Amino acid sequence: GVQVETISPGDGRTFPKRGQTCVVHYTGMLEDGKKFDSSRDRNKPFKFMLGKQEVIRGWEEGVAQMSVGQRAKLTISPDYAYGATGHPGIIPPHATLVFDVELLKLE
Amino acid sequence: TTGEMRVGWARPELRPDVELGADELAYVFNGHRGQRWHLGSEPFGRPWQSGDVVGCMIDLTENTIIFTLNGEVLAFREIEIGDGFLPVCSLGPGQVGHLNLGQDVSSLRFFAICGLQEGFEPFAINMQRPVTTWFSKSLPQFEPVPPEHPHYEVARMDLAHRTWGSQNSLVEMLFLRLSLPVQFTYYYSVRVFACVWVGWVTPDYHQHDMNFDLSVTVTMGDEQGNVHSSLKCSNYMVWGSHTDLVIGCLVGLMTFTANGKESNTFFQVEPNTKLFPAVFVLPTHQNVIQFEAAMFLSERKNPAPQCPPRLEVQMLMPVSWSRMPNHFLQVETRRAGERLGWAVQCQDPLTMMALHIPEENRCMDILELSERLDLQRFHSHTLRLYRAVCALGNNRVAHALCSHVDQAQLLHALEDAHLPGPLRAGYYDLLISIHLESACRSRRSMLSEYIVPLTPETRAITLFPPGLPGVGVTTSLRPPHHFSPPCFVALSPAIPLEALRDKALRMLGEAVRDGGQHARDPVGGSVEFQFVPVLKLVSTLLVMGIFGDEDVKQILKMIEPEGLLQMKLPESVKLQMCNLLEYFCDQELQHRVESLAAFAERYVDKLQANQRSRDFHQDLLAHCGIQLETSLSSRLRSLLETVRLSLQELVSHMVVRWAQEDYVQSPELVRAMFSLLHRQYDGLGELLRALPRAYTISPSSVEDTMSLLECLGQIRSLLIVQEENLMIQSIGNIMNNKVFYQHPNLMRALGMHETVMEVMVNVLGPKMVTSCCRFLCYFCRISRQNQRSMFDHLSYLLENSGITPLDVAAASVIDNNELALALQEQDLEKVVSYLAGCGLPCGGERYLDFLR
Amino acid sequence: EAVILSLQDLIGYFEPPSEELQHEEKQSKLRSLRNRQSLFQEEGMLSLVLNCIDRLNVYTTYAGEEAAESWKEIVNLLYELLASLIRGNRANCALFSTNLDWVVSKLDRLEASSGILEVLYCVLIESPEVLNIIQENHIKSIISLLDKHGRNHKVLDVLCSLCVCNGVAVRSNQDLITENLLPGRELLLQTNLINYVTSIRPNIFVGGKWYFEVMVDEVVPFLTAQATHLRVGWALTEGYSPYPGGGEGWGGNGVGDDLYSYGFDGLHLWTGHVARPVTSPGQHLLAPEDVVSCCLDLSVPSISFRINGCPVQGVFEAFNLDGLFFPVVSFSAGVKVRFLLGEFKFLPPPGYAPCHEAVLPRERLRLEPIKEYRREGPRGPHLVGPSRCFVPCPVDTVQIVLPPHLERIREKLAE
Amino acid sequence: EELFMVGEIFIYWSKSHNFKREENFVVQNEINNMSFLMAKAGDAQSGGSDQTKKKRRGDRYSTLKKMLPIGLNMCAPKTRYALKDVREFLQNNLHLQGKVEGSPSLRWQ
C-alpha cells in the first residue's frame, strides 16, 4: 500500500509514539504532482497529535516510518487515504497522494 | 554595441513570428548600413555605431516618425493613426543593445537634447511603474490555425475525418500537433495523398527544422554497478500513385500500421504520460493529408467508453511556430558570480504567479494573460465561478477551493501591481469570498442589532472625547466568528488575520499614495481596479470587525485627514467608498447607542435608590420621563445636551459635491449615497428606529446570550437555500438557552420569530415544519405581548394550513381577551371554509379546536 | 427560404431594447417586450419551435440535402429564436422546467451549440425552480460539453448561474459543480505561484570524455514556500532555452528533451522535466557538504553523477549527439555554489579531459546565464541575443597541380 | 542647453527677424531673389524661457512655459501682452507671442 521514501535524514532516531504532538511542514500534490496543499502556503505549521487517529491511515502509518527532524516523500495509497470516497471535490476517488513531509518536531 | 538592429515605432497588430521590418505593421531603421523598412527597405542617413544613443520620436495628429541620433534628425512620415503604436526594438543575431524608456532621472542625451523642448513624452512620465516589455522565444508553440495561415488552410467534416492542403503551393514544414493529448486499445488512423513523419508528440516539444529524425532513453544502475536496466524509452514517434493509412493505437503500448498494416512498434509503452497525436508534414502541394477498438474521441474526455466516434470542436489542428511575445518578466533574478573558486550566488527569493493549461503544458505566467486576452477573460470567469461556488456561506465547499487557490497566491494578488485588473478584481473578490463572506454575514445583521451587556466596563463608555469612530470601546457583543483552518485529513475557512489586515492596510497606503502623488499606470490598467477590489477588501474586512483602532485611524487619516476623499473618482469606486463611509456611520451609531445605553445603566441605581428612599413601576419610569416639565433630572437634561449631536458634515460637504459635479449615473450608487445623506442628517431618528433592536443585558448571562446570538447566525445564515437538520439543530439550541426565558424582550426585539416564520415561508412551497411550528408555539407561550407580535401573521398562517403550523395560531390566540377580540371575522371565514372542506374528517377537529 | 425569412423576422421582432436608451423608455419598451413574449407564449409557438428543433435534429448532413442545405443555418436560428423568447418572461423558463432534460438532450448536437448555450443561459439566468430541478447528471454533461468545446466564457457563466438562484443558493448543484470540475484540475485553468528557475553554466561548452565538480556552498531547502530546486547537468546547444518564464511543468530543469540532469536529493534524474527515481549511497540533499561531479562522455551516453565521487548508478542512454555540450546548474533563491572545473576533490578514471582544460581556443573562464535575453549591468537591463555557438574540418588542397613555368617559379619560390 | 543664456537672447534678435520675415510682399521677392539662384532652428531659444534644473522639473508640471501658452492665444490679436501681466518673463512672453504669430505663418505650410 503506502510506500514512503526518505528525502533527508533528521536525528535518524525517534520514531513517532502514540499520543505525541507531531508538528510538521509539508506539501501535497497528486500522483501526477498536481499541487493541492502546502503548510508553507499558510506558512503556519500544520500540527497534529498522532495516535489521535484524526489523519488518513497512510499518514498515521507514514509519519511513523519517519523520525525527528527527518524529511520524506509520502506516497500514500488511496486505501490508506481518501480512496474510493476521494476528497469531496478535491481528490478524485482512488487517488494516491504525494507529500513532501518535513517533520519539525515530535512532542 | 554597433550592429544591425531594427528600431522604431510599430503596431500591436504585428506578428512577432514574422521577421520585423518588411511588414506593414512596423516603422523602424537599421543600425548597420543605417537604412530602414516599412513595406520594403528605404535609404536612410547615418548608420549608428556603438555608444550612439538613439532616441525615436513620433507625432500623432500630424503624422511623423522622426528618429533621432543623439538628438539629431537625419522618415516614416504621414502614417495612419491606427491601433495605437508600440515602441519597438529588434536585435539581429548576436548584436547587442539596451533599450531604456522614461524616468527623467535616467533621462540623458536622448531626452534633454530634444525631448522637453519641442514637447514630447517619455514613458515613465506616464507611470510610477517600470514597463513590461515583450519578446519572442525561439521556441515554437502550437497555436490554432487562423483562417488563411500563411495559406495553410484547415477544414473539417464528419466516418471521422478532415480535409487538408494549403491552396497555395507554399514551401515547407507544417508541424501539426493535434490540440488534445492523452492520459493512461483505440483506433487512430491517418491518410496522406501525394514524405511525412506520422506519429505522436510530447507536450514539451519545441523543434522547428527540416531535420528528422532527431529527438533519448535511460537505463538505471544499482551502484554495484549491477543493472536496474529498465528505466526509460519515450522522449517522439515517427515514420517515412495512391493514398496511405497510418494509425496510432495505444492504451498500454504503441502501434504503427503502415498502409493500414502492421510494421512493428518502433517505439512503445510508457508510464502514465501525455502524448499529442501530432504529425510533421512537408507539403506535397495540393491536398496532402486526412485524419479521424474505441475512438480517441472517447478516451480523450469524459465520454469513455461511449464508443462511437464523436468528432469535436477542440480537435483543432495548430501548427507549431517559433516566435511569440512572452513578457519581459520585470522582476527576475539576483544572481552574482565569481572565479578562482568560481562561486556563484543568488540568494534573494522572488516569484512568478504561474499557471498552466494541463492539456498543453506550459509555464504560462498570469501576467502573460494581459496580452493573452481571451484566455485571460476565461480565467476571470473561472474566478467568478469560484466566487459563485463559494456561494454565500456554504463554507464546506470552500475548503475545496482552498485546495485550488492557496492563501499565499492571494497575498501575491495583494502584492502585484502589474497584474491586469479584471483578474485582480477576481482574486480580491476571492479573498472576500473564500473567507470574509462568512464574516460579513455574521456581523452584518449583528451590526444592526446594537445589543449591550451591563458589564461595569459598559458603565464606562461616555460619548464625547475629553467625536470620531476611532474608539475600540465597542462593547455590545457580535459573537466571534469561528474559523476552521483547512487540514487535508481525514466548516469555516481561515486566514492569517493580522497579516492580511496589515497587508491590506499597507495596500491602501500604497494605493492612495500613488494617486495622491498622482500617476497613470493605473495599477490595474484602470482606476476602478486600482481601488474597487481593494476598497472592497478593506470595507469588507472592516465589516468583519477586525482592525485594531490605530489602523482604522490610519483609514481615517487616509480619508479625512483630521485623503482618499480628496481624490476625483470613478463611479464604482465612489460606491465602495460610500460603503465605507456607511460603515463609519454604522460604527458611530453604534457609539451613540452604546453611550446612551451606557448612560441608562449608569442612571439605574441612581433612580432605584430614589424609588425606595421613603409594570406600574415602569409607568413610574415614565414619571422619570415626566422630568421634561430632582437634580438627577438636570443630569438627564445635560445628557440630552450631550446627545443633540468633523464627520457627518464632511459627508454632507462632499457627497453633495459628488451628486453635484459627477452626475451620479447608475443607481444603487445614488441610493447608498443619499442613504448616507439621510442617515447623517437626523442621526437621532436613525437612532430612534435603531433603539428597539437594541436591548441591554445582564453581564452574568452574556456568555449564554452570546451563544444564543450565534444561533441566529446559524439560522439567518440558513435562511438562504440536509440543511433542514442544521436548522432543527439551530432552533433547538434556541430553545435550549435559559436566556430565552430570561430575556424574551430581546428575542422579540430580534426579528427572530418572523425570521423563523420566514423559513416557514420558504418551507411552504417538508419535515422542518415541525421544528418551526413547535418553536413558534412555545414562542407564543413565553409572554403576552409576544403572543401579539406573533398574532399579526395569522391570516398567513391560517390560509397556509390546509393540512402542525396551525397550532401556532392556536397558541397565538389562547390567552388574551385582547387577541381574541383582535381577529377579524375573515380569518374565521377561512377556518369555517376549511371546515366546509371537511365534507370528504379529522383536520376538522383541529380547526374546531382553533375556534375553541 | 420562407422559413429563414420568418425566423430572422421573428428574431428581429423581439429584439431586446438597447441599454443606451434613457431608462424610462427602455422600461416601457421592455414591458412591451414581456408582453409580446407572453403573447407568443400562450399560443404555443414556443412548443412549436420545440417541435422544429426536434424534427430538424432527426438527421445530420436523407432529404435531397442540397435543397435543404440551409439547414445548418435554419435550426440555428430557431435556437436563437427560442432564446429570443426566453430572456424576459419567467413563464418561458417555467415551461422549460419540464423540458430542460430535452434542452440538455439537444445541447449535444454541436451543430449550433453556442446558440443552444445561449438558450440554456437565458433559461438558467431567470427562474430558480428550474435551477432546482437540474440533477446530478445533466450538469456533468455540461462540463463534458465544456471539455468538448474550447473555453467559452459563457459556459462558466452558466455554471455561475447554476450556483445561485436570485439570492438563495441551491447548494446541491454547487457541490455538484465542485465534484465535477475541481477534482480533475484539467479543463479549468489551474494555477499557482512558482519561484523563478535560474540556471548558469561555466564558460564555454564541450564537443571525448569530459568532467567537472560542483560543491554546494549554501542551500536552504525551503526558503520561499516552494521548495528550492537545484538541478545540475549537461545540455546541448540549441535545445535548452531556460527563459525566466519557466519550462513546461511549473518551471524547472530537465525540462529539455534536449537536456540531461541530476541533483537535489533522493537522487532521481530529470529529463523532459520528468524525474526518474535513481538510488543513492544513502540518499541526501545537495547540502553544502555534498559535491556533485559530472563526467559526460563522447559517443558513450550515461553521465555517472557522483556524490563526492561515490557512484550514482548508470543513467543516460541514446543521446541526441548534435553540436556542443555544456555543463549547467539550475537553482533558485537562496543558492550559492562553487564550481570546481580544476581544485577537484575527486579524480575519476573516466579518461576525461578536465573542464578546466576545456579552455583551449581563447575561452577565458567565466560563468554565463545560458543564451539569455538580458544582462543586468549597473547602466541598466541589457537586451541581448540571439548569440552564437568543433573538431576542425579543413577543405581539400591536394587535388591541384603546378604548371611548368609556374611550378618552376614555385620551386625557386620554394627555396 | 547648458546655459539655461544671453546666447539665446542673441538668437532672440534673430527671432525678431523672424517676425520681420513674417511682416511683406517683398518677402516673396526673396524667392524672386532665389529665382536668380530658417526660423524653426531658432525655436529652441523659446524653450529657454521655460527655464537649469527647473526644466527637468517641467515634466512634473504635467513648466513656467504653460503660462506663456496663455500669451499664445493673445498672439493672434505688442504692448498688449503686458496687459496679461519678473518683467523678463513678459519679454519672453512677447517672443513666444511673436513665434506663435510666426506659427500662424506655419499654417500657410
Side-chain angles (χ1 to χ4, degrees), chain B residues 435-436 438-440 442-443 478-484 492-495 497 541 543-546 706 710:
Chain B
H435 296 91
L436 298 176
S438 63
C440 62
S442 65
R443 288 182 182 76
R478 295 176 183 78
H481 51 74
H482 63 282
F483 283 108
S484 294
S492 63
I495 59 167
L497 276 69
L541 181 57
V543 164
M544 179 170 177
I546 309 170
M706 186 185 290
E710 71 180 339

Side-chain angles (χ1 to χ4, degrees), chain B residues 94 204 302 310 354 359 363 394, chain C residues 108 144 151 174 191 251 257 386:
Chain B
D204 60 12
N302 183 33
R310 185 179 185 81
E359 67 183 346
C363 292
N394 193 343
Chain C
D108 285 345
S144 296
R151 306 294 170 88
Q174 298 174 338
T191 187
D257 292 343

Side-chain angles (χ1 to χ4, degrees), chain B residues 94 97 137 204 206 217 219 302 310 314 328 331-332 347 350 352 354 359 361 363 374 384 394 403 721, chain C residues 108 140 144 147 151 153 157 169 174 185 191-192 194-196 243 248 251 257 315 317 333 373-374 383 386:
Chain B
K137 289 182 184 294
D204 60 12
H206 286 307
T217 59
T219 58
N302 183 33
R310 185 179 185 81
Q314 286 187 337
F328 177 78
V331 166
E332 62 179 346
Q347 297 302 320
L350 53 88
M352 296 178 285
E359 67 183 346
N361 197 26
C363 292
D374 190 354
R384 296 176 67 247
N394 193 343
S403 175
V721 171
Chain C
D108 285 345
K140 178 173 163 304
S144 296
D147 189 4
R151 306 294 170 88
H153 302 296
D157 291 341
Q174 298 174 338
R185 289 180 180 78
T191 187
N192 189 32
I194 297 298
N195 189 340
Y196 281 91
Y243 294 96
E248 302 303 319
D257 292 343
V315 184
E317 296 302 319
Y373 64 91
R374 178 176 178 174
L383 294 177

Side-chain angles (χ1 to χ4, degrees), chain B residues 148-169:
Chain B
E148 184 271 337
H149 177 64
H151 193 60
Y152 305 142
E153 192 168 23
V154 61
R156 173 177 295 184
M157 176 186 158
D158 188 3
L159 64 88
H161 66 80
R162 69 172 62 200
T163 54
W164 284 98
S166 68
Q167 190 159 25
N168 181 342
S169 296

Side-chain angles (χ1 to χ4, degrees), chain B residues 631-649:
Chain B
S631 67
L632 299 182
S633 62
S634 296
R635 291 184 173 170
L636 298 173
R637 295 290 182 85
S638 65
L639 189 130
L640 184 143
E641 184 68 11
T642 60
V643 170
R644 176 193 181 278
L645 289 170
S646 66
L647 168 56
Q648 306 176 335
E649 56 278 1

Side-chain angles (χ1 to χ4, degrees), chain B residues 89 91-100 108 110 135-139 202-207 216-223 300-303 310-314 328-329 331-335 337-339 341-359 361-363 365-366 374-375 377-379 381-382 384-386 388-389 391 394-397 400-401 403-404 406 408-409 412 427 720-721, chain C residues 108-110 140 144 146-153 156-157 159-160 163-164 167-171 174-175 177-178 181-183 185-198 200 217-218 223-224 241 243-251 255 257-258 260 269 272 276-281 311 313-318 320 331 333-339 342-343 356 365 367 369 371 373-376 379-388:
Chain B
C89 54
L91 292 168
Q95 288 80 3
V96 175
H98 183 199
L99 183 62
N100 291 284
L108 191 134
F110 53 83
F135 61 91
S136 62
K137 289 182 184 294
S138 62
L139 297 174
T202 56
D204 60 12
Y205 185 71
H206 286 307
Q207 297 176 333
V216 173
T217 59
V218 174
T219 58
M220 290 194 191
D222 186 66
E223 69 185 342
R300 184 58 186 88
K301 293 187 175 75
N302 183 33
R310 185 179 185 81
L311 194 150
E312 290 168 347
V313 171
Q314 286 187 337
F328 177 78
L329 275 65
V331 166
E332 62 179 346
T333 53
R334 304 292 176 268
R335 72 184 181 88
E338 291 180 338
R339 65 180 295 278
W342 291 274
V344 63
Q345 185 176 352
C346 181
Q347 297 302 320
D348 189 1
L350 53 88
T351 61
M352 296 178 285
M353 184 177 172
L355 65 78
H356 72 79
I357 188 65
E359 67 183 346
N361 197 26
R362 287 197 296 275
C363 292
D365 295 340
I366 291 172
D374 190 354
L375 185 64
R377 183 183 300 173
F378 184 83
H379 195 272
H381 292 295
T382 60
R384 296 176 67 247
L385 189 149
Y386 298 138
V389 176
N394 193 343
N395 291 285
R396 183 61 185 82
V397 179
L401 293 175
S403 175
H404 292 80
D406 181 6
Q409 183 170 354
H412 180 63
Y427 287 98
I720 290 160
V721 171
Chain C
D108 285 345
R109 179 63 65 183
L110 265 71
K140 178 173 163 304
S144 296
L146 178 60
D147 189 4
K148 292 185 178 86
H149 298 291
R151 306 294 170 88
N152 289 277
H153 302 296
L156 270 66
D157 291 341
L159 298 183
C160 181
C163 289
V164 176
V168 292
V170 58
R171 298 177 59 185
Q174 298 174 338
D175 178 68
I177 297 305
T178 298
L181 285 176
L182 295 176
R185 289 180 180 78
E186 176 180 352
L187 186 59
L188 56 83
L189 300 169
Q190 188 181 348
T191 187
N192 189 32
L193 59 81
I194 297 298
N195 189 340
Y196 281 91
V197 175
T198 304
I200 292 169
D217 292 344
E218 181 179 3
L223 187 136
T224 299
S241 297
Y243 294 96
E248 302 303 319
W250 300 101
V255 294
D257 292 343
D258 290 344
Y260 302 127
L269 60 86
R276 297 179 180 83
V278 174
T279 56
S280 295
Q313 291 86 0
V315 184
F316 298 103
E317 296 302 319
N320 296 133
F331 58 91
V335 172
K336 183 177 178 182
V337 292
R338 177 179 280 179
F339 293 98
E343 294 84 350
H356 184 62
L365 293 175
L367 55 84
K371 193 168 310 160
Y373 64 91
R374 178 176 178 174
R375 287 195 303 267
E376 56 188 333
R379 179 64 181 87
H382 298 85
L383 294 177
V384 298
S387 174
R388 292 172 186 278

Side-chain angles (χ1 to χ4, degrees), chain C residues 330-346 348:
Chain C
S330 295
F331 58 91
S332 177
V335 172
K336 183 177 178 182
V337 292
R338 177 179 280 179
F339 293 98
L340 291 175
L341 296 174
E343 294 84 350
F344 291 100
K345 199 152 301 297
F346 179 78

